[PDB]
């Protein structure tokens, strides 16, 4: 310590590329990327999403075609988000555990064609209920929890049966991680991993996602200590990996979570973060180098893995 | 869970308010402003929707409302005429330069408003770099400090309460402090840009200030920090505190919230953060497109307080102050 | 570090109001205030309390009138303290769980008229026993605990049935938080919060409160490490929020509790603290700015919420 | 367990990659090279299988591939002719010495390649010690610093971007920094060998550089650190940082990984480690015998990153860079 | 602090042997050494191992002869590794719990002849299965765990019955430490210690060991935080001592484990570490003083005990 | 428990040895010796059973066995003749004083044995205080430092490898270091008595050295530390390290083990402890009475290692070294 100018000039290591490379503390690699994908029900179709320029909803045959290039680029995993047809939404959310639902069909197709690619499914009831609430309601509109926990467990088990290696309770509820963990073990799916959405905030950054998928419990953005209690509870319940969401607006949370628990920590660069960046890049306001700058921030902040709609572009860039 | 259900405190608005850990107030806001030469001039900046370059007379008119909203301070950025740019950056310490003239006008009209001047040579050089170049094109450190010290003394003479060296030369905070003390400017605060990274988020600002064409495709990797580095920011801030800074800053902002958190935790000193032009533009573009709700503005600024910042330099300051006044 | 005069002059940030505001580390807001209220049994009555100048016991119709202004000022919650008529005090403390007791009637009235206002009820047997001890005694005068735990559970459930959002075991006993937590869950009151009086000291500052309400277990004032063990036990038993009491005389405890547990921490500025301040203000010895100075100390010390008889005055001042 | 089975993340390659905590890249590699006098000379070193001593012309040819593989820097070690060794170590600062000549040649041919010169008198003394001896045979500290400072200035004059004092004299980092600053060598980095132990793992290097016969059975216990001590390394590194080092190093490497970890955790500064000659030789001997698979090379280098090093001086650098390029 | 040259010259304590001895922070003693031994099935035989120069496989009568000198040198314990004849390897691994298996016979012989010498047996199924996997497989080749846990428990109990004072689940599995701990207690072997191979990496340094014994679950070398979670789980399951393996390539892990848990920590200087050092010593590339240098590194790094094939040589040297 | 029974590792000798956290070795021992003037003199000390005052010739004879046992160093304490005591303590720096003569004799006879001389004026003053008194009877700080510096230079001139200021004057470590550096005594170590308390355990030493009658009922509360204070010891040690001490010491020993532990944990520097005369006497009296077994000697010395000391000044050093040699 006691470093003082001019004995210490911090620009000396910045003088040349070689010394900036030798002291460089972090680096993003393709091992850090997870690509979220919106999956349609039909055959031979793609749809553009107005608020997520460059992102497409894909039927499963199209998903398989694009996955050939994602696998060649080395992306380790995908996170699937089905786009449920409105006629499949119900009150009992039976579509969540249908072995022929989009998520289950997509995961069987991908596990068969690309055996080493990781598939992370979404465990939640909101994409399948007519009302759009994440749970089954009683006559007055209040959540019945064990009826809902029951369908979620059937959902997670159906994902495990389709071959998913990871399930992600994307909900922000209590009791689900343990029930799913317990049910998977109970049913013999001992190596299915549970990626919990641990510190998930009530945020305006999810806007574009509601367009993509066709749609009191999320955390207050002001709170930071509360996120550590959320992650601790998920860890205690058996989560294998924990996630912070949204991402860049919560980088201080990523840093605190990694420092406190030293566990596998993930971060979601959500639809609104992607949309802001891409709109600015397309308008000529920001250079495309901001994509890698934003992703290296997650590594510097302490994330092991990043769910990002820029995964393909970033993997292509990681070459330079 | 079941004993500990964290949803209980979240159930109702009253209990969420009681347990809310951080709050954004107008005391935390600093508004950066782009100032033009001449009279009765107002110019839109396409890459910063909603922001205008203003001549001093127009700045004084707009500042009446910034003061009424209670914004504590402005950060001035002069839009130097192309013909006043040179290799020696001498316009940086001209007593009749835009920054100096704007400072005297604002200090007279609004005595309680804080004026934070920019100490840096980028608005004044033909090449757009923040210091003086040697014959190999390197930004010289100590020769640049000599010009920055002359610049900071000129701002103190104009009445600025705070000078903010945004240059990233090593040792400049101590040089400027020594010069201010020697000259009797005992209470001029120095707001150091301590951990300032070599980023792509500054694009729109280069357009706003008129340095974009001068810099061209140039980079500042020999002085601004590598985005990959976090421990190094602690060493930058420690030096600036030992050299006499009254406030230390992290820049850019949202992409570096982890740095704000480490800096506040390690040094427990007045910590500031800049929500830069590219952060403003990306949000504004998405809000205008209808992709993000307007509530994202306060959410973005709340993140800086949660991460540990005391004050935030933000182009959203007027809008945020209007929304907080509710 | 290595900050030294005259390079570092700490008065520079204090030179002007604008720079004092920019570096100001804490601020009190109306979101931090909880107002305790003494509730009478009758109709159209108020009583002055000699040792708490300016504070009044209020019948429920008067309470509703005053609550209109507390709600307009933004105060988030009230803590109710019934003033039990002597003819309702018994040996079995049945009045504690009477659905027509003052606390239950007051909470139903307030929950119906002001649905967003939080109500924190007092769970304790002392206001309802003839002897004034917080528990039911056996023939020799010794506490029978499960008979007492039983009535306290009926009490907390009766509060939950009346609509209380928060119950506060204001006792300083062991076993109660868990029994109440367990009983509320068991009965379906899953979102009722439990605000534990965790570090509550044996103190002379409660004097005036005994006048207001008509009335071996509290902590020794010398002890600080002991308070952390008290808070840890309440947290383990399911408390949603933890409180230190009294307040200003124990600000070091507030700081240690927030630092150690990072949980929602509350502090009671008790009747004697209020009385000392108000007597000095009324005598012209202290300016009224001391009220906000005393309340900002709780925020600086680490409290999230403050139970204070000055809540109305403070909310009115928070404007300047 | 059963809830927490740590084997779940280990089950598949994709999940092992997602949770992998550290990675080795070519940015982390520094290749040490032994340089001969003369022209068209290449010599094998029996105790360092696969490593050759090279004349400058041969070094320039081999460096074309080191540069193509992206290795950031070389660390030069001159093989001084026996007749140029003396009590005064004057060849250490000869402008026409091997290190000086090699540096000028490499700086001209490969402008972006980092050149790290060795500041130490062991290649130049008749006795093989790293400093000047007094009449009792003790290695004098301050008289040795005077020669090391002349040596470091000569390397800066030859164009080295980094000088690395590997001598273990007290206070030499500050003396060398002061001399570099006074002479205007503002940006010459100083890579201090901070916690360098008195070890048996240096045997093969003494053969490679030609100091083995000069040192004989001599020891360096009055200056290199006792292998038993760990807290003492923190005091060595603290002094070198206060004296102005830009990088600090632990040496040897694998036998001292605990020291690398404590040094990175305590100071959060650029931390380097040397996988010394004896570590290289023991691995190479076992790999050639078929006792260890070739995958041990990357496993050994991954350990340095896991332990906290930013950069690694390793004789395996070319092989490792070839394997990483996949 | 604030130590600065020339007031502080760190060479002053290094000037003389006496002051280097007074400030010397660590020292290796014979109390720190554990010698691993490869045991053959027959009588009056020894075999040289090509990739471990100087190490020999020993029949039990030869083992007893060599143990006389190990005991005279003060070595506290041996770790036995039987060399199973191929005709004893099966699918059910019954040889693991045979009371007449090499390990059991060797431990009864040593416990009877040298009552104070500690014996650490290896609990694992890999030396006894035809396939060489550490577990019993079902028809498709997948591990059946309770059949395997069952034989391992019989194995550990058979070791305890033969007189072993320590058993070492050398596996890298979950559930075994607890089952063995539970079974030993259940059976009355309350003082048998369990030395867990806690942080055991997937490494190339085990090469020579496969030659010596005739032969998804081991840790990734890149991970360090993961090792702390591994050690914590073993401690929670009842391990008496925890070990890091391999050794010198993982000294940073030894340091973190000792610092985090402050528990009895052991480290294995594996076959490849021994082979590299001995090959270099025999080639004249390294002096034999490197053996003690390598072993003092383990003490400096925080190990209490070291499993090392150099134990005999080191104990002989510890005299100088 | 039952899973975790801490008795399991304790069950057998082999497992207790494997988990044993600390060990005492002869490397940790320093033997204090009381030296007389004259020839062929040996005197028993009733309050320190087993300890003798020895003339230099007798000291050289006894030191042959201390050296054979491997004890690293001696700490010399001269038994000044009554007639050589004065107000100015000039005998402290007499080149022909007992300490100076004993040092030259031992350095010649046993070149590898460490000699630690005592820097303090208590053996030389008529009043027994460790410094010079003013007219109010106060022990002057800076005037005392001037005499201690002359004393320490005389010990360095006599050949002592270590001087140990046991005086408790503020700032003396830095004064002595500056004087040693200025005079070229570069490698003379300074073993500071850093946290030395005003204790009743020193009684027997005052008898051994002959200062007891001079001090009478006097006290040293204006300079030695109050036994109640622990945080203050950290401030004493920090100053002595910043002033250049090579080793820092806590004294007395067993009654202050908590201070040894805090000092090693806080500073991670070479830490020494003195098992003072009264600790020796109380143990010896109990052992001779048959109240405590002789095994208490090693138990007492093991406590210092467990508490964090690297070295121990103990009158039991010969006995302990004999017992460790087993
Ligand atoms: Mg700086
Ligand atoms: Mg050094
Ligand atoms: Mg002192």
Curated annotation (Swiss-Prot), chains B, D, F:
What's this protein's name? Delta-aminolevulinic acid dehydratase
Partners and quaternary state? Homooctamer; formed by oligomerization of dimers.
User: Quick check: keyword Transmembrane helix in the entry?
Assistant: no
- Which prosthetic group or cofactor does it need? Mg(2+)
Q: How is its activity regulated?
A: Stimulated by magnesium ions.
Instruction: Report the function annotation for this chain.
Output: Catalyzes an early step in the biosynthesis of tetrapyrroles. Binds two molecules of 5-aminolevulinate per subunit, each at a distinct site, and catalyzes their condensation to form porphobilinogen.
Q: Looking at the UniProt record for this protein, which Gene Ontology cellular component terms does it annotate, in alphabetical order? A: cytosol
Query: Which controlled-vocabulary keywords does the entry list?
Result: Heme biosynthesis, Lyase, Magnesium, Metal-binding, Porphyrin biosynthesis
Q: Which residues form a coiled coil?
A: none
Residues of the active site are 196 (schiff-base intermediate with substrate), 251 (schiff-base intermediate with substrate)
Which organism does this record belong to? Pseudomonas aeruginosa (strain ATCC 15692 / DSM 22644 / CIP 104116 / JCM 14847 / LMG 12228 / 1C / PRS 101 / PAO1)
């Amino acid at each position: 310590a006691n470093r003082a100018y001019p004995y210490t000039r911090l620009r000396r290591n910045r003088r040349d590329d070689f010394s900036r490379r030798l002291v460089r503390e972090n680096v993003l690699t393709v091992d850090d990327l997870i690509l979220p994908v919106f999956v349609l029900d039909g055959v031979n179709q793609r749809e553009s999403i107005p608020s997520m320029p460059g992102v497409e909803r894909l039927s499963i045959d199209q998903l398989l075609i694009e996955a050939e290039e994602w696998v060649a680029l080395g992306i380790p995993a995908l996170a699937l988000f089905p786009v449920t047809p409105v006629e499949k939404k119900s009150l009992d959310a039976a579509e969540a555990y249908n072995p022929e639902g989009i998520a289950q069909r997509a995961t069987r197709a991908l596990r068969e064609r690309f055996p080493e690619l990781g598939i992370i499914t979404d465990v939640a009831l909101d994409p399948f209920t007519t009302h759009g609430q994440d749970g089954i309601l009683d006559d007055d509109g209040y959540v019945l929890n064990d009826v809902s926990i029951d369908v979620l467990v059937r959902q997670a088990l159906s994902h495990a049966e389709a071959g998913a290696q990871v399930v992600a309770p994307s909900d922000m509820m209590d009791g689900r991680i343990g029930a799913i963990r317990e049910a998977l073990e109970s049913a013999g799916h001992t190596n299915v991993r549970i990626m919990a959405y641990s510190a998930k905030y009530a945020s305006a950054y999810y806007g574009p996602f509601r367009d993509a998928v066709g749609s009191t419990y999320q955390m207050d953005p002001a709170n930071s200590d509360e996120a550590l209690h959320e992650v601790a509870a998920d860890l205690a319940e058996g989560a294998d990996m924990v996630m912070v969401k949204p991402g860049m607006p919560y980088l201080d949370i990523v840093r605190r979570v990694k420092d406190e628990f030293r566990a596998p920590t993930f971060v979601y660069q959500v639809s609104g973060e992607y949309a802001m960046h891409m709109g600015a890049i397309q308008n000529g306001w920001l250079a495309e180098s901001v994509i890698l700058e934003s992703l290296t921030a997650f590594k510097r902040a302490g994330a092991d893995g990043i769910l990002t709609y820029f995964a393909k572009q970033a993997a292509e860039q990681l070459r330079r």
